[PDB]
């Protein structure tokens, strides 16, 4: 489906979703998210028992989310560190969404963004960053992803 079937697990304790799953609490409840990334226009906390990060993004190309990278790298982290599961949600759960996971990913490993994409797509295949995302993944992979990756190490 061109927004997923669900909320999908990506990585323990981290999972994608579309704005449906996001407000699905037995969906919620069975995979014990107590965390929730919300990047879409009218991101906003919603719920009861969960720690929002809301991150008002449009998809486009032209929308900068590299600038988003490092909070929702350490909001996933330390809620990963704390053996809590978050979830991380657009729209559909295909663009934005994706693309801060997939950043979180490359941090968290040696992948680049296609193979951090491909991590994503075996959990949620409609994964698809938009043009202007994967341009702006390419560039962090290029000149920065090293830099975050020492960080955490540091950090966490």
């Not at 489906?1 to 919620?28: C, H, S, T, V, W």
């Not at 330390?78 to 978050?86: A, K």
Request: with cysteine.
């Amino acid at each position: 489906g061109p927004m997923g079937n669900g909320m999908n697990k990506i990585l323990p304790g981290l999972y994608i979703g579309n704005f449906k799953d996001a407000r699905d609490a037995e969906q919620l409840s069975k995979n014990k998210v107590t965390h929730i990334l919300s990047v879409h226009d009218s991101a906003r906390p919603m719920l009861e028992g969960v720690k929002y990060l809301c991150i008002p993004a449009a998809d486009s190309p032209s929308q900068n989310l590299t600038r988003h990278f490092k909070e929702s790298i350490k909001f996933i982290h330390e809620c990963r560190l704390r053996g809590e599961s978050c979830l991380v949600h657009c729209l559909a759960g295909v663009s934005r969404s994706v693309t801060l996971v997939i950043a979180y990913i490359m941090t968290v490993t040696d992948f680049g963004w296609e193979d951090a994409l491909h991590t994503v797509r075996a959990g949620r295949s409609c994964a698809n960053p938009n043009v202007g995302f994967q341009r702006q993944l390419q560039e962090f992979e290029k000149h920065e992803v090293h830099q975050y990756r020492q960080w955490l190490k540091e950090e966490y």
